[PDB]
Structure formats: C-alpha cells, structure tokens
Amino acid sequence: DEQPEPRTRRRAYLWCKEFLPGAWRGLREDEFHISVIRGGLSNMLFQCSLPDTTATLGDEPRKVLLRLYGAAEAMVLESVMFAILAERSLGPKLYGIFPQGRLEQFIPSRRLDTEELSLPDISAEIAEKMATFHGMKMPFNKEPKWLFGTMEKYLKEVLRIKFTEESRIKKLHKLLSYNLPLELENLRSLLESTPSPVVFCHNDCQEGNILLLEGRENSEKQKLMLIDFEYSSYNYRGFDIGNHFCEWMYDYSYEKYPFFRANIRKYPTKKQQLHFISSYLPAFQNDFENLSTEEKSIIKEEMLLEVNRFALASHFLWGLWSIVQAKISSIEFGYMDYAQARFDAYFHQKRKLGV
Amino acid sequence: EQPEPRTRRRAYLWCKEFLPGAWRGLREDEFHISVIRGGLSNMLFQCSLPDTTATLGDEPRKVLLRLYGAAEAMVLESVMFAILAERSLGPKLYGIFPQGRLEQFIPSRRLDTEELSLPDISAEIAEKMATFHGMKMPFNKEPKWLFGTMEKYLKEVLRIKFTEESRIKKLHKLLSYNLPLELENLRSLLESTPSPVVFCHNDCQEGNILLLEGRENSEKQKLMLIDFEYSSYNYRGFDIGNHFCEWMYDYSYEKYPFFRANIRKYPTKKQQLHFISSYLPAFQNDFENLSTEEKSIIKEEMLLEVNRFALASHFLWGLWSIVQAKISSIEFGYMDYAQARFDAYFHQKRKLGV
Ligand SMILES: COc1cc2c(NC3CCN(C(C)C)CC3)nc(C3CCCCC3)nc2cc1OCCCN1CCCC1
Ligand SMILES: COc1cc2c(NC3CCN(C(C)C)CC3)nc(C3CCCCC3)nc2cc1OCCCN1CCCC1
Ligand SMILES: [Cl-]
Ligand SMILES: [Cl-]
Ligand SMILES: [Cl-]
Ligand SMILES: [Mg+2]
Ligand SMILES: [Mg+2]
C-alpha cells in the first residue's frame, strides 16, 4: 500500500510501456513510479507515472491508473460501456485494455463522504449528472429485467446458503423468518403498479462513486463526476434515484466492526427530495420549466411517490446481495449486520408509506 | 434467403429487446429477416420493420445481425467496433450480446478487384487508410504482430505432413526455397526500412471496402472500410504494401482454384504516387505547404518503404495459405494461392534488386 510486490510492479511496467505512447515507449524499468491506491484479491488500483524529470513528446499523460481484475460476457459489456463513456467524455479515458486489467485516465479528485450528499449544491449536481446518464443510448438490452432478475438471482443463492458459525446461522435464520420469497412478490405488486420510465441507470450512485474534481471546488454546478458503472443497466428511473436517497443513510468508511454506520434519520426530507428532483427534471427534459406551476407540482408529487417506493427495492436488493457476500466474500465487513440494516429500513419505510 | 426458424425467433427477440421505438411492440408475424451471408462463423442477416409500420422516433427501419457462430479477441473487436461507431468511422452499434451483435445496416456493395485502380477509388482508399492510421486505440502499440505471426505460421508449416501426390509435390517446392532463411533476410531488410508504427487494418482489399449506395456520383466520401479482424499496431508500410498486392488478386472466381492472380495488375509507380499523394496530406498536417523538393523526397522514400513491406504481405499470406491447406474448413485452392504469393515475392525481390 505504498509499493506493490515484485511481479505486479514489472507487469505494470510492460503494460505501461507497450500500451502508452510517447515517453512511455522508451522507458527503462528503473524509472517506473508505481504506488498502490487500493489493494485486495479483486480490483486492485495502482497509480503509474513518469519521473518528474522526463518531459512528454505529445499529448500522452504523465500518470495513469492501472486496474487489475484478479480471478467472458460480463467483461465484454463493461469494457464496451467504459470505452463508449470514454469517447463521449462522460468517463475517464481508456488508454489500454488487456485480459488482466486496463489502463485508465487518472482523475485528480477525492470521493465524497456520505454527509456531503445533502449539501444543496452537491445534491443539485448529482441530480443533473444522473439525469444526463439517464438520457444516454447504450447498446444493451432495453427491457427492465435487471431489477427483479437480480433480486431473484440473489434470493436463489440466499436460500442455498448454510453457515457453520453459530452467530451467522442465527442472523440468517432471522432474515429468513420474514419469508423473503413472499416479500419479494409483495414488492413486485407494488412496483408493477408504480409507473417509472426505463432509462440507462448507474444502479450504485453513492458517495464512493462520486468524484470531487481537484481545483473545481468553487464551481457551483460542475465539480463532480460519476464513476464505477459495474451495475449499470436499463432499469426503472425510480430505482436509481431511490437507491441514491437510501445512500444518504449509509457510511462505509467506519473504522470498526461492522465497518459501516446506518442512520434512518439521515434519509432526505420531502424538502431535500424536492430540491433533488427540481434539479433532475429540467436536466432530463429542458422544456420542464415552461409547464404550468400546477402541472409541475403534479409531476413532482407523482415522482416522490415513485422514487420512495423504488427505494424499497434498493433495501431488498442490496440486503440480499449482502447475505451472499457473507458466504462468498473474503473482503472483511459486517455483511450480515448490513443485511439486517437494509431489511430494518425496508420494513420501517414500508410502514411509513402505508404500503 | 429465409433463415432457420430458430434463428428467426432468436433474431426477433434480440431486435425487440435491443432496439427502441416501433421494434419494442413488433409481433413475431410482422418481423422480416433474410440471410445476407451464411457460413459457420459471422453469419449475417438483414432484419427490418414492415414497410407499412411507421417509426416512432430515430430508430432504424433495418439493421444487420451478426452471429459469431464458431476470449480476449471478442472484447478487443467489440471495443474497437464501439469506438469506430462513436467517432462516425463505422456503422453504429445497436446491440451486443454473447451470440452476436446488431449493427446499423449500410446499403452498399463491396468493390471488385478491378475497381481498386479507379483513380477516385484509389485516392479515397488512401485518405481512409491515412485516417485509420492516425486513430488512437487502447491496444498494444508494440509492432509484434507481423513477424510474430510470420514466425508462428512458419513453424506450423515446417511440421506438416500431407497425404496425396499433388499436395506433397506442391509443399515440396515451397519448402525448397528455404523459408526460414528468407524470413531472416526479410527481417533484416525490414529492420533497415524505417516505417512508422500505426493502427493498421492489415487486410485492406476490395472485399473489406464498401461503396455506399446513393454516393456513386461523389468523387470523394463514397467508401467505408470494414472488417477489422486482423487489425493491430503494425508498420504503416505493411498496410499500404498489402493493399498494393491486392490489386493482383481476385477472390471471386467461380472455378477452382477460386482466385485469379495477375502480376501485371500491381500498381505502376504513377498509380502508387497517386495513392500516396492522397494519403500523405490526410496523415500529415501541413504536407501540402512543404517545398516541392521535400514532398518529392518524402514520396520517393515512402514508395521504397511500401514496396519492401509488400514482400512481407506475400510472405505472411503465403504461409497463412499453406497452414489453411491442412486445417481447412473452406473450399479453395490454398496451395495454388500460396504458390502465386511466393512467385510474386520473388518477382518483387527482382524488381527491387534485393
Ligand atoms: C460493502 O460495501 C462497501 C464496502 C466498503 C469498504 N469496506 C472496507 C474494506 C477495508 N476493511 C478493512 C477494515 C480491512 C473495512 C471494510 N470500504 C470502502 C472505503 C475504504 C477506504 C476508506 C473509505 C471507504 N468503501 C466501501 C464501499 C462499499 O459499498 C459501496 C456501495 C455498495 N452498494 C451497496 C451494496 C453493493 C453496492
Ligand atoms: C480465401 O480466403 C477466404 C475465403 C473465404 C470463402 N471462400 C468460399 C468458401 C465457400 N466456397 C463455396 C463454393 C461454398 C466458395 C469459396 N468464403 C468465406 C465465407 C464463407 C461463407 C459464405 C461466403 C463467405 N470466407 C472466406 C474468407 C477468406 O479469407 C479468410 C478471412 C481472412 N483472410 C485473411 C487474408 C484474406 C482473408
Ligand atoms: Cl460460516
Ligand atoms: Cl411465494
Ligand atoms: Cl454517433
Ligand atoms: Mg451512502
Ligand atoms: Mg485483391
């Protein structure tokens, strides 16, 4: 986490030398500056750079980002998608693609923290960016089968899990006592009666996937970038917004077990919600502000009902996801606790909605 | 003309789910499909709306379905195809799935071999190739493809045994040239021949060049290059040299051996200069403002570059054809083709005095 091991220092040297143009092409192995940004057995991020002494021959970058995958059809789609967003200037540039990983533009930035999501200027721009993402045409299946198809898939895995550790057994037993198969069908009824346009959705728009771009912090409307499009698909718009509202409540930076904080009281208020969708709607159809005040009020009221219902699917889906991570993950986290938190929020909001 | 019923139904669902507008509510009984290209790999179909169905927005009325049929190649080609589309250099990409893809249907036909020498065609092939060559692509910029591939095919060639009389007497003549030595002399000649490394098509021939329907009367901007299976960072001289060699080869002949070869059809110096006089301003910013002397010098050197790299075209595709002779799936005179390429290789050596 300041240097990498002996192999994936040299592999990254070759990659950078072979895939990057200009001064990268004639670089000796002992000039190569690499330093870890994130580790793991999956999705390792490194920074790779020229020495500061070396000058550039053309418009090649000084530093890049190396992304290793780390043990077919999933990787074609996200690669094509990444390449497309890169060409449309809606993502970081793609400098190299190979079986083990890819070379990307390094964006000087940090991630938002959870508590920044509520800042009015942050929220307004997230809404604008999300509305732009939602207008994109992508070469993927336009049927909104992702939401229930993913929930069904995770539920099938959840019902096959057997734990051996007593504490995980007891926690799983409590989640199963809810009758998740039946609860999924109640959510199906609710959501099939809630109209929500099908759009190209990020599906994971939270603070860890939003960049605050270095030296733009005084821009009111143009300091952020959305990244990490792994779960993206054509989906109900209500889910991308509702999932985002859910993410106000969750902080994944907590340093002790269970490695997250959950706070129901941080969900956005009607006022905060209205502020977000007041920025989202004119960004998605730019004639919106010319509708009658009454016609706009009706649209906003409908959309509050829409997004707060689809937010229940955020809890259900990521709760099921977390139980699966508990069995199969070797990243360290309170997966079972996070699942319980998502299902606690599910039942609390359901009851508040009267649905 | 009409595909198998299972293909009809798979195509219908791909179209219905990947394409917007009137496609989303089309019934199976309204769906039109026909075969454009059979085979075992890269089957092509045209899929269309009924003539009496109106579009609802900007969706196409007709698309092309490509089925792969029979790893790190699929992502590369898919990424490249998407990128060309985003840059308005290729057909749009409307759908990608594991079995294939949906693309913009471009009314067009492929050129014939004889059309390569039409001056307006030749000039535009050069401009398009220059444009290809200036593209940044996220692929390996190390020029290993050419000799990498020649070495790989030579090996397979050396350890191949044939049954019949005809194939063994043909393989005997080819091996009698001492191909491992020729490779190393070719390698030496090309290492002494400066040629920039650029993103190359590697197969720029008449069958990979579309003439766009309705644009026949335009001098310029009536072609499109397609089919980048062999594309890679490579020496520029190879892309041009290979294209010049393809003036000599017609792959549309219907009797065995299923090609014609004509050494006299290689472009004359004048034809070659016409080509590179269109290429150079499309590749190099202010080429036209250079002195007459500097332009002449750049062109003379480039003719030497490309005519030396043409040797590698003959060599590489000669080897390729022998290999295809053993592991063939397809009906063609591969060994005859291979002999035509080595004959041209030796002719071009003489011409060059090397
Ligand atoms: C389970 O999900 C996350 C786990 C995360 C996580 N885990 C850490 C890893 C190190 N580990 C150490 C004690 C060994 C502590 C546990 N760390 C971080 C960073 C680490 C750097 C400092 C800031 C925060 N972000 C995370 C984001 C996560 O999800 C984001 C949204 C997920 N959506 C909803 C569900 C799936 C899609
Ligand atoms: C000589 O090389 C090719 C010959 C080909 C060929 N020949 C057909 C076989 C069927 N046969 C019929 C009597 C049955 C008539 C002769 N057919 C096809 C398909 C078959 C499906 C329908 C037509 C289209 N593709 C070919 C691709 C070829 O090139 C290999 C690809 C790249 N190479 C690299 C160097 C240049 C091109
Ligand atoms: Cl366990
Ligand atoms: Cl049930
Ligand atoms: Cl476009
Ligand atoms: Mg959050
Ligand atoms: Mg030809």
Total domains present in chain B: 2
Domain with B245 in it: 72-91+106-354
Q: Does residue A355 share a domain with residue A315?
A: yes
What ligand has the least distance to the C-alpha of B83?
5
The whole-angstrom separation of Cα B166 and Cα B46 is: 41
* R_g of chain A, CA atoms, integer Å: 22
Q: Could you tell me which residues are beta bridge partners of residue A67?
A: A45, A102
What ligand has the least distance to the C-alpha of A204?
1
Q: Distances in Å between the alpha carbon of A27 and those of A23, A49, B145, B300?
A: 7, 11, 21, 33
Q: Could you tell me which residues are beta bridge partners of residue B103?
A: B64, B93
Any B CB within 8 A of A263 CB:
no
Residue A81 CA, ligand 3 centroid: distance in Å: 36
Give Cα B213 distance to the centre of its chain.
20
CATH of the domain at A44: 3.30.200.20
Q: Does residue B97 share a domain with residue B141?
A: no
Q: Is residue B272 part of a domain?
A: yes
Q: Does residue B122 share a domain with residue B255?
A: yes
Q: Does residue B163 share a domain with residue B31?
A: no
Q: Is residue A46 part of a domain?
A: yes
Which residues in chain B touch residue A102, judged by CB atoms under 8 angstroms apart?
A: 138
Q: Is residue B130 part of a domain?
A: yes
Resolution, given in Å to one decimal, reads 2.4
Q: Is residue B237 part of a domain?
A: yes
Q: Does residue B85 share a domain with residue B37?
A: no
- B25 CB less than 6 Å from ligand 2? no
Q: Which of A16, A24, A73, A81 would you mutate first to test chain B, the one with the most B CBs within 10 A? A: A73
Residue A332 CA, ligand 1 centroid: distance in Å: 9
Ligand 1: nearest atom to the Cα of A335: 1
Any B CB within 8 A of A26 CB:
no
* Residue B29, C-beta contacts closer than 8 angstroms, at least 6 positions apart: none
The whole-angstrom separation of Cα A109 and Cα A211 is: 6
- Of B105, B130, B157, which residue sits at a domain end? B105
Q: Does residue B134 share a domain with residue B42?
A: no
Q: Which phi-psi region, left, alpha or beta, contains residue B25 (left: φ > 0; alpha: ψ -120 to 50)? A: alpha
- Of A84, A106, A128, which residue sits at a domain end? A106
Q: Is residue A342 part of a domain?
A: yes
Tracing tokens 């969708």 back to the chain, one arrives at A277
Q: Is residue B314 part of a domain?
A: yes
Any A CB within 8 A of B76 CB:
yes
**H helix or E strand, kind and range, residue B9:** helix B5-18
Q: Does residue B214 share a domain with residue B100?
A: no
Q: Does residue B44 share a domain with residue B64?
A: yes
CB B183 within 8 A of CB B299: no
The length of chain A, given as a count of residues: 355
Q: At what angle do helices A335-353 and A166-176 cross, to 10 degrees?
A: 20
CATH of the domain at A343: 3.90.1200.10
Q: Is residue A253 part of a domain?
A: yes
Q: Does residue B272 share a domain with residue B330?
A: yes
Q: Does residue A38 share a domain with residue A82?
A: no
Could you say which DSSP state residue B3 is in? P
**H helix or E strand, kind and range, residue B95:** strand B93-97
Facing A18 at nearest CB: one of B79, B87, B141: B141
Ligand 2: nearest atom to the Cα of B40: 21
Q: Is residue B1 part of a domain?
A: no
Q: Does residue A111 share a domain with residue A45?
A: no
Tokens of A154: 């995770």
Q: Does residue B180 share a domain with residue B126?
A: yes
